[PDB]
PDB file of C-alpha atoms and ligand atoms in Angstrom:
ATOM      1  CA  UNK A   1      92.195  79.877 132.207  1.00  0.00           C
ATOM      2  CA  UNK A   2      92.900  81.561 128.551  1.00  0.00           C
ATOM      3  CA  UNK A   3      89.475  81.885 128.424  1.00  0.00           C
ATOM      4  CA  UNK A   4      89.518  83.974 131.466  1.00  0.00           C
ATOM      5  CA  UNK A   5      92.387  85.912 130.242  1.00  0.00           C
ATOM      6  CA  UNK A   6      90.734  86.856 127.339  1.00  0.00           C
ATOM      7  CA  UNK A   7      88.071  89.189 128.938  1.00  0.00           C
ATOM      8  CA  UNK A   8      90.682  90.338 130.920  1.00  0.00           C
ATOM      9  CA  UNK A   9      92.746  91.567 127.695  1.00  0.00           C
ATOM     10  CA  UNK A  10      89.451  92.895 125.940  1.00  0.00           C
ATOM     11  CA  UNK A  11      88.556  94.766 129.318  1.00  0.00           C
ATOM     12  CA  UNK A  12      92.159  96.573 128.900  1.00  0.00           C
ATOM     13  CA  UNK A  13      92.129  97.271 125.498  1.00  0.00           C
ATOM     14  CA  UNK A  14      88.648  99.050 126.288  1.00  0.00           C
ATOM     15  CA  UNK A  15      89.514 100.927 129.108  1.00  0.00           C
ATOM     16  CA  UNK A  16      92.741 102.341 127.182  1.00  0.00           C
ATOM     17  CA  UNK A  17      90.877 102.988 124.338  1.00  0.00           C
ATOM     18  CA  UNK A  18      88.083 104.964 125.855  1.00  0.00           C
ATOM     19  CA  UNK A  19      90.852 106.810 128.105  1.00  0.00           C
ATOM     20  CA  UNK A  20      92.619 108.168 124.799  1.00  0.00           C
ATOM     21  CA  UNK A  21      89.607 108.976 123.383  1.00  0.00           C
ATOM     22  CA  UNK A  22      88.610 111.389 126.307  1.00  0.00           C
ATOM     23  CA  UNK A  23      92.223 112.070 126.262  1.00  0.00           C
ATOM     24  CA  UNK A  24      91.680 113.453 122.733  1.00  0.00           C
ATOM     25  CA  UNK A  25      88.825 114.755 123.482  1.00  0.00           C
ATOM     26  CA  UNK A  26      89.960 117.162 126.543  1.00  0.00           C
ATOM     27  CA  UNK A  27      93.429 118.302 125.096  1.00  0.00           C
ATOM     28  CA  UNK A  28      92.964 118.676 121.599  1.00  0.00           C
ATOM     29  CA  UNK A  29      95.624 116.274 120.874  1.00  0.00           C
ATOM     30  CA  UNK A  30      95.588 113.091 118.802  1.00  0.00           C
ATOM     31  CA  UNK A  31      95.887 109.919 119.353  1.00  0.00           C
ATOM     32  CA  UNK A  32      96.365 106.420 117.821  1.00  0.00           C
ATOM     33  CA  UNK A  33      96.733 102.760 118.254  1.00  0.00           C
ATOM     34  CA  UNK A  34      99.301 100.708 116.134  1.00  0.00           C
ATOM     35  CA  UNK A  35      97.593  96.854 116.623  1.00  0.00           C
ATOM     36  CA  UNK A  36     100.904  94.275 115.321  1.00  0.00           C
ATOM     37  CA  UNK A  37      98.795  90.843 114.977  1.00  0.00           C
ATOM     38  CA  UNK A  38     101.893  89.051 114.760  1.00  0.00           C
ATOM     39  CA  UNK A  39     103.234  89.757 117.812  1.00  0.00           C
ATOM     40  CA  UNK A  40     100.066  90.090 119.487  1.00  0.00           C
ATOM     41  CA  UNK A  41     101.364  93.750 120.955  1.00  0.00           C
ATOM     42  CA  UNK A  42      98.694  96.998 121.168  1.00  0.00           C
ATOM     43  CA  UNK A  43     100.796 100.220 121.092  1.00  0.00           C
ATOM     44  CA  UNK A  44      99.155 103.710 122.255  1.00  0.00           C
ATOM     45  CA  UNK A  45     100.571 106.227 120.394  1.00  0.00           C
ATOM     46  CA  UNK A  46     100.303 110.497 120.121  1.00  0.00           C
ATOM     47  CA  UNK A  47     100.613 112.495 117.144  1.00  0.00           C
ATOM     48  CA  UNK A  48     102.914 115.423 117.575  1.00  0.00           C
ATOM     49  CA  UNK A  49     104.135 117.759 114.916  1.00  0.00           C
ATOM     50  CA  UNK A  50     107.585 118.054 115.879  1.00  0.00           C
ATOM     51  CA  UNK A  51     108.229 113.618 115.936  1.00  0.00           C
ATOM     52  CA  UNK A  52     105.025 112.567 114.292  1.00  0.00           C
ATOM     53  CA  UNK A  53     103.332 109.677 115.735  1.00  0.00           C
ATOM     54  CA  UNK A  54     105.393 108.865 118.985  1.00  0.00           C
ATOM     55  CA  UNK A  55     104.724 106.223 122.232  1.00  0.00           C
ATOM     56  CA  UNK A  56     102.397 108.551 124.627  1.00  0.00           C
ATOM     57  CA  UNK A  57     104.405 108.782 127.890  1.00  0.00           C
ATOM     58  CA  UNK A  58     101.737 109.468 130.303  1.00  0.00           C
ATOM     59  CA  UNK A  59     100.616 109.038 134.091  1.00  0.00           C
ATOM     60  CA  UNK A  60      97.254 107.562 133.383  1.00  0.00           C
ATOM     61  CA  UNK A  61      98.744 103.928 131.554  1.00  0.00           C
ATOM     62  CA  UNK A  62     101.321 102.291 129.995  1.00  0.00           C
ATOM     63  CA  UNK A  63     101.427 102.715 126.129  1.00  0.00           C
ATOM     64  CA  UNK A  64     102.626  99.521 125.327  1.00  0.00           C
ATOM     65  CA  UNK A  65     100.627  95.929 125.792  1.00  0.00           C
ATOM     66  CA  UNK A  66     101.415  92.351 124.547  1.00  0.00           C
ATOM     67  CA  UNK A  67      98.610  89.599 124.774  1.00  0.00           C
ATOM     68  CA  UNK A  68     100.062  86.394 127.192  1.00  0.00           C
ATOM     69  CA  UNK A  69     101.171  83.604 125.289  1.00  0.00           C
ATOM     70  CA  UNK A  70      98.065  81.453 124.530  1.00  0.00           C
ATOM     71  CA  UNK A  71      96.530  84.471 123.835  1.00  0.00           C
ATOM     72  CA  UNK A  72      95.581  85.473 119.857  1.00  0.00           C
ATOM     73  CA  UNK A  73      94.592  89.032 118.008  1.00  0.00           C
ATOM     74  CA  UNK A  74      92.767  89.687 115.296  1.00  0.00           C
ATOM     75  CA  UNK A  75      91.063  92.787 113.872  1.00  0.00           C
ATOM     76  CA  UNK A  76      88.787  94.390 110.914  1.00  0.00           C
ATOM     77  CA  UNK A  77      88.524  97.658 109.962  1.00  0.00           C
ATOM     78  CA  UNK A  78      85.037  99.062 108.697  1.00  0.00           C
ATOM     79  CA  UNK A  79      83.269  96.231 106.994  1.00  0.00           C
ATOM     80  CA  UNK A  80      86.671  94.876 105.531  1.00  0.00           C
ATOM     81  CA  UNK A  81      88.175  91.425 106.561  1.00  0.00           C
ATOM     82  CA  UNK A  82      90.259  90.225 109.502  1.00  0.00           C
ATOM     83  CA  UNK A  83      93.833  91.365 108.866  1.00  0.00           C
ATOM     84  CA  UNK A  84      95.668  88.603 110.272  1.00  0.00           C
ATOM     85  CA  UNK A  85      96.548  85.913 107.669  1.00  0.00           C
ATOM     86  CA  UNK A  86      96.749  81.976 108.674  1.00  0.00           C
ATOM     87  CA  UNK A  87     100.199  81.194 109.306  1.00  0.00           C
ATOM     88  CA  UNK A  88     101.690  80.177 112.653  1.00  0.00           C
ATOM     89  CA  UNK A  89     103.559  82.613 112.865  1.00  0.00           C
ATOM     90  CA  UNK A  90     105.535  84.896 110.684  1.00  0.00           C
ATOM     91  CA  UNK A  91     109.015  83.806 110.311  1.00  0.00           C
ATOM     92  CA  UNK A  92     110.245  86.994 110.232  1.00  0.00           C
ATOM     93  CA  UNK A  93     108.845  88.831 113.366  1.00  0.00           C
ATOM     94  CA  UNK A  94     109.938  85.895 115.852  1.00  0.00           C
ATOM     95  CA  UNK A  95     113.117  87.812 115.320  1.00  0.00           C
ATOM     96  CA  UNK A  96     113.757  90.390 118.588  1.00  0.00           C
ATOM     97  CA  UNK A  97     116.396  91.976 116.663  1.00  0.00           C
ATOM     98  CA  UNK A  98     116.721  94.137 113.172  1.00  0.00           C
ATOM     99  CA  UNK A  99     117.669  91.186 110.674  1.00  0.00           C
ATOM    100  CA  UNK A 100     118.272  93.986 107.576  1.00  0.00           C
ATOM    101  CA  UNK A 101     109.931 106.284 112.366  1.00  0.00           C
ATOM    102  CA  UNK A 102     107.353 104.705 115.283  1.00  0.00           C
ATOM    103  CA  UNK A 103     104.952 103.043 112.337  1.00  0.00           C
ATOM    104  CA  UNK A 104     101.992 104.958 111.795  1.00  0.00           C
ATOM    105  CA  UNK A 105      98.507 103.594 114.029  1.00  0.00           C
ATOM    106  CA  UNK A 106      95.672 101.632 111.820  1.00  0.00           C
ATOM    107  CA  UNK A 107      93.039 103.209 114.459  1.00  0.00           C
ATOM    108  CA  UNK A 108      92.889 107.025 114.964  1.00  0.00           C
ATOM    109  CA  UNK A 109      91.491 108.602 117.610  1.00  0.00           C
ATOM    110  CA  UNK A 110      91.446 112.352 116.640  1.00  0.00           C
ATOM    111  CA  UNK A 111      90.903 115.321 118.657  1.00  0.00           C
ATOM    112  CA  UNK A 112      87.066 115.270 117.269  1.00  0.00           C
ATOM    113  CA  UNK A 113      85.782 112.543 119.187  1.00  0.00           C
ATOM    114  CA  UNK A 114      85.652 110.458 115.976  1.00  0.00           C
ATOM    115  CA  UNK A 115      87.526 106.869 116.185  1.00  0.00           C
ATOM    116  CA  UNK A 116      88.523 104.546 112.901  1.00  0.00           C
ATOM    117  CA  UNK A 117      85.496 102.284 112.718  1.00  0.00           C
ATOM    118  CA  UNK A 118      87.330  98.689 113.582  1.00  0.00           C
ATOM    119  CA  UNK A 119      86.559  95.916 115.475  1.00  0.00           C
ATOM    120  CA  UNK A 120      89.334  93.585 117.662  1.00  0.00           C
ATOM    121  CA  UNK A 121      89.164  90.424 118.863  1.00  0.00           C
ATOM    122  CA  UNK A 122      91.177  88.719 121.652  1.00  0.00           C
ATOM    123  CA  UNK A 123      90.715  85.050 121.939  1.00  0.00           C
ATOM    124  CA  UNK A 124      92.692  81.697 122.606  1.00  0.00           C
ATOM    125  CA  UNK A 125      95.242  80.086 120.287  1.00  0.00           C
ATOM    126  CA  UNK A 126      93.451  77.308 118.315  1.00  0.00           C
ATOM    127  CA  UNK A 127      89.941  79.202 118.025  1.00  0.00           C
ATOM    128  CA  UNK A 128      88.823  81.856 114.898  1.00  0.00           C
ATOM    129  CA  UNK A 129      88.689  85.537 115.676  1.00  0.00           C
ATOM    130  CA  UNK A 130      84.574  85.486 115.246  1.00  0.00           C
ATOM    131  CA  UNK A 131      82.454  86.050 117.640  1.00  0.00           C
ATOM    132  CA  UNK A 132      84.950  86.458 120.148  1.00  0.00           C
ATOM    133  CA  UNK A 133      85.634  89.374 123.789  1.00  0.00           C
ATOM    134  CA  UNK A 134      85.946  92.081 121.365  1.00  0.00           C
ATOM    135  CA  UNK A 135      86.060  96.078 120.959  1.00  0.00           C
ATOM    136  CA  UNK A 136      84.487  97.661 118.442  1.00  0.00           C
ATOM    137  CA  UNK A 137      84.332 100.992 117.700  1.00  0.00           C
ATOM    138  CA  UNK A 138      82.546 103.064 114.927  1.00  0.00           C
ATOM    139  CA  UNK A 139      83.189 106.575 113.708  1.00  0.00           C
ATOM    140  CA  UNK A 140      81.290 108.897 116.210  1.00  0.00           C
ATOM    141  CA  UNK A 141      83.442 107.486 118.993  1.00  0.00           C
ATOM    142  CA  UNK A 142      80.675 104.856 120.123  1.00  0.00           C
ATOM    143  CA  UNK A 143      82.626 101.928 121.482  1.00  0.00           C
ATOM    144  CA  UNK A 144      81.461  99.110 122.813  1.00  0.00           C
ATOM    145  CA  UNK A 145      83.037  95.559 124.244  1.00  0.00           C
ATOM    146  CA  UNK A 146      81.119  92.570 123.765  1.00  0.00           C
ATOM    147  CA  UNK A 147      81.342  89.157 124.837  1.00  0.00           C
ATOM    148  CA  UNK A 148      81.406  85.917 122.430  1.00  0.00           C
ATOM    149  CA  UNK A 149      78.745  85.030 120.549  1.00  0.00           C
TER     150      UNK A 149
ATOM    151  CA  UNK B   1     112.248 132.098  83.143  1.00  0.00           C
ATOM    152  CA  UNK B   2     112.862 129.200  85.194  1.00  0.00           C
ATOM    153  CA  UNK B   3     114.217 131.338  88.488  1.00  0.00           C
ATOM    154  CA  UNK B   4     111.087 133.186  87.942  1.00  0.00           C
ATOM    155  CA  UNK B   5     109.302 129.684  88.153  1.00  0.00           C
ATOM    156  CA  UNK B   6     110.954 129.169  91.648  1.00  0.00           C
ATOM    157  CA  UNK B   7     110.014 132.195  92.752  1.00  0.00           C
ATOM    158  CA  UNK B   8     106.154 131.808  91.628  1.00  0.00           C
ATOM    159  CA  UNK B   9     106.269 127.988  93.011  1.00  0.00           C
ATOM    160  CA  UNK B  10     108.050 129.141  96.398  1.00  0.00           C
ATOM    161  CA  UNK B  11     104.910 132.119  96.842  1.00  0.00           C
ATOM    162  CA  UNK B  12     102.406 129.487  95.668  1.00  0.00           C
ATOM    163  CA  UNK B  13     103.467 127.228  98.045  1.00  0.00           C
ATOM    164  CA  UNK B  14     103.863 129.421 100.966  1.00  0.00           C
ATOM    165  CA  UNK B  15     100.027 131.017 100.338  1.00  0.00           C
ATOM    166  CA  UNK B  16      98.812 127.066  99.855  1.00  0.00           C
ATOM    167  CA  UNK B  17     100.573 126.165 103.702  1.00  0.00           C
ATOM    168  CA  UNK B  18      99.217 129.174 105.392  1.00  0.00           C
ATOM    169  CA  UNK B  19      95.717 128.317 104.069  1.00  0.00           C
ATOM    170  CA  UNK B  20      96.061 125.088 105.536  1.00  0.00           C
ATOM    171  CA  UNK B  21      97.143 125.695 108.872  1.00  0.00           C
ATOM    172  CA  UNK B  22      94.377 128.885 108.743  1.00  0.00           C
ATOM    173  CA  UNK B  23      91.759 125.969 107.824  1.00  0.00           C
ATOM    174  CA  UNK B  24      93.565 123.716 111.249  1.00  0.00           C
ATOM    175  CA  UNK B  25      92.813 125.796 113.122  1.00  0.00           C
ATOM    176  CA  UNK B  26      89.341 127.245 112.312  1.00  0.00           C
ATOM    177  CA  UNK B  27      88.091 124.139 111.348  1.00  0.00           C
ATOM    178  CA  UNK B  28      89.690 122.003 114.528  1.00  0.00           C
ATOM    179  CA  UNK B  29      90.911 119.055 111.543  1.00  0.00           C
ATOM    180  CA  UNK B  30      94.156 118.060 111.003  1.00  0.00           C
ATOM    181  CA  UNK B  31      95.601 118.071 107.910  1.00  0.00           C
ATOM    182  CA  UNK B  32      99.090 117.864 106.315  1.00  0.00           C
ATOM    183  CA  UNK B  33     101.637 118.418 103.194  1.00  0.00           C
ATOM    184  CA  UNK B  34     103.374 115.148 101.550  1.00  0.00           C
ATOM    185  CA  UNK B  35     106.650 115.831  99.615  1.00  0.00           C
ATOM    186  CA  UNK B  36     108.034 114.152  96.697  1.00  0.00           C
ATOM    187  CA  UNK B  37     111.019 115.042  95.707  1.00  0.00           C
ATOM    188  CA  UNK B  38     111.478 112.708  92.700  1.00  0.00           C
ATOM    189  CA  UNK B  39     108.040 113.830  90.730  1.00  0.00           C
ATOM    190  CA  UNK B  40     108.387 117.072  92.033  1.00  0.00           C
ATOM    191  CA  UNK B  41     104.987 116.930  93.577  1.00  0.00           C
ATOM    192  CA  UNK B  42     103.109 118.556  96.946  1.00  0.00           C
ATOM    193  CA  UNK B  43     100.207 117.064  98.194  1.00  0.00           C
ATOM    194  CA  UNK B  44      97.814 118.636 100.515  1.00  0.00           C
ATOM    195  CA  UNK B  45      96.111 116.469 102.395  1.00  0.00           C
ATOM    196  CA  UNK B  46      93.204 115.698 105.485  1.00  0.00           C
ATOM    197  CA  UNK B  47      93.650 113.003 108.200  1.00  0.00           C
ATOM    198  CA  UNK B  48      90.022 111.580 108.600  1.00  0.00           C
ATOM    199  CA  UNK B  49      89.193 108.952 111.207  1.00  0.00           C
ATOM    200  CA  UNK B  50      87.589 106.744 108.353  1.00  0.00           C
ATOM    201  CA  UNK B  51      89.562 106.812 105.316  1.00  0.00           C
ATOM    202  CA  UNK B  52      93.219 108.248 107.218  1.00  0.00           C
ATOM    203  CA  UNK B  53      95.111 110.466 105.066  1.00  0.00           C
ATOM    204  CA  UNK B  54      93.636 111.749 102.098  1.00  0.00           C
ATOM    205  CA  UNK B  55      93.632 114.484  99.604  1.00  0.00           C
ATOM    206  CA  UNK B  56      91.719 117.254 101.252  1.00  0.00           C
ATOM    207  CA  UNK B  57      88.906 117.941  98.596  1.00  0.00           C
ATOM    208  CA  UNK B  58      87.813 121.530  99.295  1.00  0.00           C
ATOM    209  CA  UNK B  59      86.182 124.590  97.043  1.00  0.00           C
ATOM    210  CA  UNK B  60      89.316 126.697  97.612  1.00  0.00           C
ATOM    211  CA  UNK B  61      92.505 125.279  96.867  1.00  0.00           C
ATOM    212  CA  UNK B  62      93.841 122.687  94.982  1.00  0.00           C
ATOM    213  CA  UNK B  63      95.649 119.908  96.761  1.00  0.00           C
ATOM    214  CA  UNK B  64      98.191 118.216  94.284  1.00  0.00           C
ATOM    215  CA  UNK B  65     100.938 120.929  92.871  1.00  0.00           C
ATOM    216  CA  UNK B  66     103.736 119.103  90.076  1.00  0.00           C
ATOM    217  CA  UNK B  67     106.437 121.459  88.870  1.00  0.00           C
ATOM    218  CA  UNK B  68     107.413 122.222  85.992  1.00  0.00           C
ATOM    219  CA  UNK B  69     109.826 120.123  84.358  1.00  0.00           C
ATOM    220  CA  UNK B  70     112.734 122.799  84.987  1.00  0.00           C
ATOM    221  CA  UNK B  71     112.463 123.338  88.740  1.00  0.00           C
ATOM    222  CA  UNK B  72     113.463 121.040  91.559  1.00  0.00           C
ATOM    223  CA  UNK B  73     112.658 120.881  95.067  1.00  0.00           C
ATOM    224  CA  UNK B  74     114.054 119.622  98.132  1.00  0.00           C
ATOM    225  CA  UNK B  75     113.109 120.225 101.895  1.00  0.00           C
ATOM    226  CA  UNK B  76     114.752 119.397 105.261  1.00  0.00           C
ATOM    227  CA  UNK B  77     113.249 118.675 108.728  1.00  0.00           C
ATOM    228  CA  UNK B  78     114.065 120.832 112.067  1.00  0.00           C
ATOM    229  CA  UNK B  79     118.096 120.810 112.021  1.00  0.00           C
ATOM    230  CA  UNK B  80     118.278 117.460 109.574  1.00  0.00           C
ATOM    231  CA  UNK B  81     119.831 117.171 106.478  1.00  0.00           C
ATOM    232  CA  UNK B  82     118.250 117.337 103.356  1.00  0.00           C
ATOM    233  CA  UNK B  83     116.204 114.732 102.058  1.00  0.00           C
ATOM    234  CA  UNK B  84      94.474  92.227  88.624  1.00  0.00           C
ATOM    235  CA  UNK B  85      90.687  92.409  87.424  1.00  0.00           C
ATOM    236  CA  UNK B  86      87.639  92.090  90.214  1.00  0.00           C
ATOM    237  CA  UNK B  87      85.415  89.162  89.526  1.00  0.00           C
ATOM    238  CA  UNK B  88      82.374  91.222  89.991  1.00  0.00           C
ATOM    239  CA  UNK B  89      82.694  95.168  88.897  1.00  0.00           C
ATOM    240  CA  UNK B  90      80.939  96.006  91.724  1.00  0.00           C
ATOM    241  CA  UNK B  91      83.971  94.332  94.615  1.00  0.00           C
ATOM    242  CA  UNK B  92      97.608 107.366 100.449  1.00  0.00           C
ATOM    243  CA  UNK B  93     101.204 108.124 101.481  1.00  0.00           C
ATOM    244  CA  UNK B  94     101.426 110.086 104.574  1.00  0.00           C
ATOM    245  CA  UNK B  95     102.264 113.669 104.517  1.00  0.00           C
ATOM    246  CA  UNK B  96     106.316 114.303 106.392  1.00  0.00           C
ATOM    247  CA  UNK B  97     104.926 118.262 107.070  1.00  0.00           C
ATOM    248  CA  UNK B  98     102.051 118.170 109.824  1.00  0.00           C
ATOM    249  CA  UNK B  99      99.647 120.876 109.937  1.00  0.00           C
ATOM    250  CA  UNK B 100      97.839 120.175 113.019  1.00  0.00           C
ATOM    251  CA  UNK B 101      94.678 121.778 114.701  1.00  0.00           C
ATOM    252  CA  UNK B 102      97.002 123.438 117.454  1.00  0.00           C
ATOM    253  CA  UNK B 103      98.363 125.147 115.069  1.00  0.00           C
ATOM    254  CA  UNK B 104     101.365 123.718 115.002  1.00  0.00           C
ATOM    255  CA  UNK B 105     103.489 122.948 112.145  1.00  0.00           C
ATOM    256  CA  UNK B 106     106.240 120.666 111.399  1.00  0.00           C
ATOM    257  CA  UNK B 107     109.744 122.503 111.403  1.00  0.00           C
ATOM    258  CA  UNK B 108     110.603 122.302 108.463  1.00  0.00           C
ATOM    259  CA  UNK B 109     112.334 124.030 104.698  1.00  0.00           C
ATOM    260  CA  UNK B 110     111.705 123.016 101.184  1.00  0.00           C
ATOM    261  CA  UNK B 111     113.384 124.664  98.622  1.00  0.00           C
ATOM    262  CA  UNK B 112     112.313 125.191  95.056  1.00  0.00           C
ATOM    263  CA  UNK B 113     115.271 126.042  91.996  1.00  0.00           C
ATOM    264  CA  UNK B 114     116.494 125.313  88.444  1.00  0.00           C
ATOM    265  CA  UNK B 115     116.970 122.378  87.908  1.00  0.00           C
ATOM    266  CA  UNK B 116     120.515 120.949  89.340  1.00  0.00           C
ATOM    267  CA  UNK B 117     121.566 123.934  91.610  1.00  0.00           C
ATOM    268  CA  UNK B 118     122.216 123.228  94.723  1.00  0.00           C
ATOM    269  CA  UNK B 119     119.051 123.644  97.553  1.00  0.00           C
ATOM    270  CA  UNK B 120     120.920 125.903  99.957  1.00  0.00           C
ATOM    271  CA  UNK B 121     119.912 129.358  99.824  1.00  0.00           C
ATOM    272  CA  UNK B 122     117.076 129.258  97.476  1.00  0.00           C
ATOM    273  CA  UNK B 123     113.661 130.378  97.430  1.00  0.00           C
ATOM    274  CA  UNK B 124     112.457 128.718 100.366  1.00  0.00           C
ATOM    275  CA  UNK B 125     109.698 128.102 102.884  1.00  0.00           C
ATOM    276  CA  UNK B 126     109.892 127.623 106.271  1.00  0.00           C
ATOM    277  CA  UNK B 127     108.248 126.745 109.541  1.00  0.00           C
ATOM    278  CA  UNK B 128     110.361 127.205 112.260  1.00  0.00           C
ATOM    279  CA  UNK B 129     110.751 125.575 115.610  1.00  0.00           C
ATOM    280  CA  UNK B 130     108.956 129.328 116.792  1.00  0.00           C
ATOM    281  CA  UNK B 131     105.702 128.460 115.259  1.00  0.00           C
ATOM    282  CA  UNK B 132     106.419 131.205 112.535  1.00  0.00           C
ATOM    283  CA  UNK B 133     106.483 130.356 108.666  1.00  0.00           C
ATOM    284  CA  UNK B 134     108.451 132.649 106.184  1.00  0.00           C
ATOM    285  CA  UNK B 135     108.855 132.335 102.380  1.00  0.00           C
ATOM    286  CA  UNK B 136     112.467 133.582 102.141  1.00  0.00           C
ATOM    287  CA  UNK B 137     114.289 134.804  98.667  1.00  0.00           C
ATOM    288  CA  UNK B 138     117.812 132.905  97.853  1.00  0.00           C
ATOM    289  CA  UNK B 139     120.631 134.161 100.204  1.00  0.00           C
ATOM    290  CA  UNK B 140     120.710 134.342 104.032  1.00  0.00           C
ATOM    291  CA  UNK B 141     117.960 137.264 105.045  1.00  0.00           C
ATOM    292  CA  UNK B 142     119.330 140.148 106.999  1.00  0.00           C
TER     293      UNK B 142
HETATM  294 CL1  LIG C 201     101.957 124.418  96.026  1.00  0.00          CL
HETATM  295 NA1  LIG C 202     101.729  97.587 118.532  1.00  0.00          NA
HETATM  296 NA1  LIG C 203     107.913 106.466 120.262  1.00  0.00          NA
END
């Protein structure tokens, strides 16, 4: 059910997030991850200094995920307020194609250890990101996935 | 006069990047330099996990440079061309240079002259693909 899925997506987003953040950790390198609420995609991303922030083509995971339809994302950063306003959908990023430089992560996972405090939900069309699967992380790197309620 | 501005701005510069990537790698932070051409401004900033890019707030250096009204600057990248009130009182632009704890620096030249000459062949510094950065007098070096 999309209940079901919904643990399912939260396990994933965990396991990639703790993986960049050993990543990080280990090679010295940073990492990011670019969360796009409105079309529900997760993108893992690697700071170079030659391209900047670029997809991280790896052998450990893909570095590109997009929640099955039925399927909502929300998020928070730090104490602040879920990012994803109340529309339907935005009319503009139904849109596959350009209608009128890999955008820059919200979360970054840095070399230190330290992760952007933030917390994502994952959670079934119709229902309020609260109390929902969820990641959170705060700044030490402590990360944690938690069930509803 | 204002080609001895450049020149002072181009050194300045140059000393203010190779004190950043010194502090990169010593410290293990990242940090970075944000360019804008129209104000004529060079910021210096940190990337921190918690507040992302920000002016990097240190005892040594200061992290915002303006020219003076006479100079302008430009830079390039690698081979590119060049470029309401609260209810209750209580309730930053990325950098395009990356200075990061490798070490590694973006490739990169910015150029600093008199006002409306041309940014080829300047006083210049660069970081190139090699890892090394130069501060280079106008004309090609030997
Ligand atoms: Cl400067
Ligand atoms: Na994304
Ligand atoms: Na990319």
């Amino acid at each position: 059910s999309v209940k079901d899925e919904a643990k399912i997506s939260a396990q994933s987003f965990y396991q990639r997030l703790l993986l960049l953040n050993e990543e990080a950790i280990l090679s010295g390198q940073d990492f990011g991850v670019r969360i796009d609420v409105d079309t529900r995609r997760l993108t893992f991303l690697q700071l170079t200094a030659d391209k900047g922030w670029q997809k991280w083509q790896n052998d450990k995971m893909t570095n590109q995920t997009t929640l099955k339809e039925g399927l909502q994302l929300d998020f928070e950063l730090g104490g602040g307020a879920w990012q994803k306003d109340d529309r339907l959908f935005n009319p503009g990023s139904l849109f596959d194609e350009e209608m009128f430089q890999e955008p820059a992560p919200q979360l970054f996972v840095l070399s230190s250890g330290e992760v952007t405090p933030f917390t994502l939900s994952i959670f079934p069309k119709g229902q309020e990101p609260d109390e929902q699967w969820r990641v959170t992380a705060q700044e030490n790197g402590t990360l944690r996935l938690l069930a509803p309620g």
